Amino acid sequence: KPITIEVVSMDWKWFFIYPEQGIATVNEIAFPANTPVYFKVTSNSVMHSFFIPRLGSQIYAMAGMQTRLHLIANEPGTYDGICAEICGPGHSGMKFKAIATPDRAAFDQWVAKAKQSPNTMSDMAAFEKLAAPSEYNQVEYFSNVKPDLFADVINKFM
Ligand code: CUA
């Protein structure tokens, strides 16, 4: 089973959503190796560029629209992610890490850990507070997420 990951590029950090499992994160994602991954991408501000050099994969993120990317990580390990288009002050620290696990069980562990988080992203005041301008954000998980947050974000521009 391929995993679907939603991505919202914010002013100088990446917000990730896992619609299926009901968890969200900041600057870090995990998923099984040799497994298909579908990234549904958008931006809540200016235009950014989602890039992962060691997988040779890239895609732009613009407000109001949804872009798509598909990929398979051939080997387990962490892969560095960067924002490849100048977008202001925190351009250089607008990075993320992707962890391709050795199996699904290991991926299901990362997820469980995410569910043990006290932070949630289940309302309007949570999302906009996160969206506010910050730089070099450290990893962060959210145990819950608003049911249709991706669409909600996009349609603010629609
Ligand atoms: Cu976003 Cu550089």
From Swiss-Prot:
Q: Which residues lie on this side of the membrane: Periplasmic?
A: 1-158
Please give the knockout or disruption phenotype noted for this protein: Increased reduction of the ubiquinone pool (in aerobically grown minimal medium with glucose).
Q: Where in the cell is it found?
A: Cell inner membrane
Judging by the UniProt lineage, the source's domain of life is Bacteria
Its quaternary organisation is: Heterooctamer of two A chains, two B chains, two C chains and two D chains.
The family note in this entry says: Belongs to the cytochrome c oxidase subunit 2 family.
This chain's function reads:
Cytochrome bo(3) ubiquinol terminal oxidase is the component of the aerobic respiratory chain of E.coli that predominates when cells are grown at high aeration. Has proton pump activity across the membrane in addition to electron transfer, pumping 2 protons/electron.
Q: What is this protein called?
A: Cytochrome bo(3) ubiquinol oxidase subunit 2
Q: Which organism is it from?
A: Escherichia coli (strain K12)
- Of the parent protein, the shown chain spans 125 to 282 of 315
